[PDB]
Design a protein around this ligand. Structure first.
Ligand SMILES: COC(=O)C[C@@H](NC(=O)[C@@H](NC(=O)[C@@H](/N=C1/NCC(=O)N2CC[C@@H](C)[C@H]2C(=O)N[C@@H](CCSC)C(=O)N[C@H]1C(C)(C)C)C(C)(C)C)[C@@H](C)c1ccccc1)c1nccs1
Length: 253
């Protein structure tokens, strides 16, 4: 692997690694309480032996620049972070894969960037959502205080999340966990659109998902394909991420 640095529209440095390969160029986008290490720890990276893999730390996470404001964590800023990575490696065609809110980010990048030939959203759909202001603020307070890492650790452990997902929360600054949570009130509630007719859009979730409705809505509205994994919940579906990587490798082949 080589490391890289790019700059987002608002000047935030975005750091990541590039794993060279002769195949498709794949850009991986992690979730809120994660960083770029989850791709190797989940086994997703090893499931793609031929791809040229680009994995970034989103703003405020890992080795990327700190933010510390709610508006600095607006969805549009994450989109700009990812598009800056697409610029650095100069390809005309990219395949994006994102986990949880990283899936929402990947879908929105696909909507605005004609260089995205494929977008895969793992355990997130593309539809408009209602975000309760009070509950999200409550959650921001819980995750940003001294007990925030334990709060997330206990929540994810209790819901059967994989160990790498539990452990990743403690590597995110508490202040950025709070700011990213509040950032969801700045645009993340809108649906995503199809970027161009030839795009391959894929949604993935647990076959036991208690709310599959919006995933089917994405099939109808965007012409997206729906992949299911054997799990009772979205969090437990994260235990299937390496398996999903193998299926992604099949598409890329
Ligand atoms: C069944 O599976 C789930 O619904 C859990 C799953 N979530 C999601 O898939 C999506 N979101 C949600 O459905 C809801 N959103 C919340 N809060 C905003 C939010 O998302 N977060 C804040 C902290 C950050 C870790 C992240 C999060 O995960 N929080 C958890 C609680 C974890 S600690 C007690 C959490 O869901 N809370 C809820 C409360 C309202 C209860 C506070 C609404 C309001 C959007 C419908 C998420 C991908 C998204 C999708 C589109 C736009 C924005 C965000 C995940 N669990 C861990 C990783 S992804």
């Amino acid at each position: 692997r080589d490391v890289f640095e790019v700059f987002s529209r608002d000047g935030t440095p975005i750091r990541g690694f590039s794993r060279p390969g002769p195949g498709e160029t794949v850009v991986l986008v992690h979730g809120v309480a994660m960083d770029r290490r989850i791709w190797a720890e989940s086994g997703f990276l090893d499931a793609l032996p031929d791809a040229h893999v680009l994995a970034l730390d989103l703003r405020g996470r890992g080795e990327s620049g700190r933010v510390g404001t709610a508006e600095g964590h607006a969805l549009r800023r994450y989109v700009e972070d990812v598009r800056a990575v697409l610029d650095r490696f100069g390809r005309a065609r990219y395949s994006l894969f994102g986990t949880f809110f990283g899936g929402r980010i990947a879908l929105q990048v696909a909507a605005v960037d004609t260089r995205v030939a494929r977008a895969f959203s793992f355990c997130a759909h593309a539809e408009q959502v209602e975000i309760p202001e009070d509950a999200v603020e409550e959650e921001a307070v819980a995750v940003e205080g001294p007990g925030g890492h334990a709060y997330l650790r206990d929540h994810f452990t209790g819901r059967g999340a994989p160990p790498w997902m539990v452990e990743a929360c403690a590597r995110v600054d508490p202040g950025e966990l709070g700011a990213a949570t509040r950032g969801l009130l700045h645009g993340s509630d809108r649906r995503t659109e199809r970027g161009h007719p030839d795009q391959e859009l894929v949604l993935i979730t647990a076959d036991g998902d208690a709310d599959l409705a919006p995933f089917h809505a994405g099939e109808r509205r965007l012409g997206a394909h729906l992949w299911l994994v054997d799990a009772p919940t979205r969090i437990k579906a994260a235990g299937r991420l390496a398996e999903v990587g193998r299926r992604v490798a099949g598409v890329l082949a």
